[PDB]
Amino acid sequence: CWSYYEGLTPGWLNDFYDVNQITPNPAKDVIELVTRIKIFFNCLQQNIQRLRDIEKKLFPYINFEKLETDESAFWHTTTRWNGEVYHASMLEFDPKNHQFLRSKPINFDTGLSFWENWLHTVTQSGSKGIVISASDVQLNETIRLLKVLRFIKNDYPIQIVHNADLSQDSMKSIIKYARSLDTAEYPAQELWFLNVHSLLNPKYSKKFTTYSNKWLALTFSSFEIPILMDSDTVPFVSIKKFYELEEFQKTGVLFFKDRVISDDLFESSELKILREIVYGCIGLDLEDESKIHEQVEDPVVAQVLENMFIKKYKHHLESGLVILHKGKHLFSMLTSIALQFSPIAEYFHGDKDFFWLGELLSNNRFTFHPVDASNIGQLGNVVSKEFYQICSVQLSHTDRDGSLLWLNGGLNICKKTSWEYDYEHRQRLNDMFQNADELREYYASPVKLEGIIIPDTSISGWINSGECFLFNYCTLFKEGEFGKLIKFKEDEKLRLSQIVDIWNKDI
Ligand SMILES: Nc1nc2c(ncn2[C@@H]2O[C@H](COP(=O)(O)OP(=O)(O)O[C@H]3O[C@H](CO)[C@@H](O)[C@H](O)[C@@H]3O)[C@@H](O)[C@H]2O)c(=O)[nH]1
Numbered sequence: 001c002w003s004y005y006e007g008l009t010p011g012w013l014n015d016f017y018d019v020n021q022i023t024p025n026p027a028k029d030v031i032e033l034v035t036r037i038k039i040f041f042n043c044l045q046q047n048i049q050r051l052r053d054i055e056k057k058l059f060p061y062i063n064f065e066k067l068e069t070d071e072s073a074f075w076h077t078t079t080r081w082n083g084e085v086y087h088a089s090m091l092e093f094d095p096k097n098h099q100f101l102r103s104k105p106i107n108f109d110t111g112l113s114f115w116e117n118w119l120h121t122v123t124q125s126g127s128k129g130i131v132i133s134a135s136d137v138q139l140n141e142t143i144r145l146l147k148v149l150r151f152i153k154n155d156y157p158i159q160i161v162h163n164a165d166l167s168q169d170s171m172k173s174i175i176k177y178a179r180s181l182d183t184a185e186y187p188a189q190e191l192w193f194l195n196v197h198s199l200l201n202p203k204y205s206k207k208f209t210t211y212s213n214k215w216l217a218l219t220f221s222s223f224e225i226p227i228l229m230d231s232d233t234v235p236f237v238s239i240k241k242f243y244e245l246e247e248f249q250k251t252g253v254l255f256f257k258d259r260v261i262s263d264d265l266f267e268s269s270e271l272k273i274l275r276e277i278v279y280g281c282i283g284l285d286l287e288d289e290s291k292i293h294e295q296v297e298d299p300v301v302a303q304v305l306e307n308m309f310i311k312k313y314k315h316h317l318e319s320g321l322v323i324l325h326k327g328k329h330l331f332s333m334l335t336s337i338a339l340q341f342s343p344i345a346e347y348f349h350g351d352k353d354f355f356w357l358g359e360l361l362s363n364n365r366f367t368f369h370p371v372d373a374s375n376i377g378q379l380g381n382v383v384s385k386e387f388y389q390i391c392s393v394q395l396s397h398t399d400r401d402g403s404l405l406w407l408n409g410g411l412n413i414c415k416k417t418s419w420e421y422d423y424e425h426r427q428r429l430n431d432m433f434q435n436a437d438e439l440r441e442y443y444a445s446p447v448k449l450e451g452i453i454i455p456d457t458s459i460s461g462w463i464n465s466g467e468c469f470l471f472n473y474c475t476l477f478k479e480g481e482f483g484k485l486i487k488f489k490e491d492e493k494l495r496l497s498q499i500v501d502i503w504n505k506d507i
């Protein structure tokens, strides 16, 4: 359906939005970005140089110039823990034992599209692996994650993706903690490094910043079915348990729910623009709450849309742990990237919420894990006339049965370097300590995982304590009144205490 793209303005582009750019019609601009990508992957189901000209305007962040001229310079480079380097190569792994097999070279089929090439010629079908977006900044957090993966005896390969911003020193240190002291109880990890800098066109290569790097990590990872993790993420179950979750099995995405923040609400002008985008993309009308439940078959997804368009909430997905099957979700993911650098980029915090918005607006099947996000730490007694309170930076995620799956925020009190501000401005910290230096030591001290509270946001939700530079939140539980409590057994407390110990091990 070349006719569509010939009908567009000659200079048309899926460009990365800039605040300076004059945008009178943001809703229509977003609808165009989503539609142009939808039309593309639909007309591929139905002139090689014509296709490439559309690709260059749809995906300008790809360095198609280098692919066409000096193909070997364009392709990404993977580096194994052993020190072996692979150029323009496809990594293959054993689906059963997850161990590395071979690296067949990339034979780019000119008859197929770039993204079709990426799934068939560049990537091994069914390949599963842990993916982490890391610069030199994320070194320490990445080390601490590796230690925990080794402690729980992870067999899945790990790939650390960077944009030529991870030093040889950092990689050496990662390989050390990944491989050293190999044993059955603390096995070495099949770790890889991936530099995507060659794939990215120099104009857009620098535009992927902070959380946006996670799109580079996820998209270009050597696995078809990556499990993306924050460096500050901590899994408390074997990786296979995440893949086994029914939500991923049925949809091919594993998405977890975020904190409910009732402080930070959308303006009516913002919701009007979001309503136009949704209707413009998938013909869904979000005018009244009654007709939302009707038009959305999955009540878990309906609840998220109710929260956004009725209750005006901005935070829905936590991208600390994400599974995405690129075989079923690549076109959705590429829409997420378009939206990430769209006029509505400023509406949401980082990447997390563009995961599900990409799925929704692309009209691809998705869902969330239905369990609400939870707080984890010490069950402090609240004086009333069982009342418990947890105040932490840690955001936990439990299964239906109530087992801890994972958390984001690391396993120290506070990761932020805010002790100077926090000591002067927060009463509890100001009274409790004598200097800001004493607060620094408290912030660096390990956390103690004794229980979990799943707050009832309708009665007593998430309350910002102001501690750790307004990253610390308090959750309340009162028996038969509001919330759900989960007290860890001595067996569990011991396992968790061992995991916090290995995480906090002072480099
Ligand atoms: N390469 C690279 N990766 C980065 C960078 N900044 C962040 N990341 C990656 O993005 C992750 C998320 O950053 P956090 O600092 O852990 O954010 P958070 O407190 O967990 O915040 C929440 O919102 C983020 C933005 O939507 C989410 O990405 C995150 O998972 C979480 O839900 C990091 O762990 C790391 O893997 C960067 O400059 N470079």
Ligand SMILES: [Mn+2]
Pocket: 230, 231, 232, 233, 320, 408, 409
């Ligand atoms: Mn995090």
Ligand code: NA
Pocket: 116, 119, 120
């Ligand atoms: Na294909």
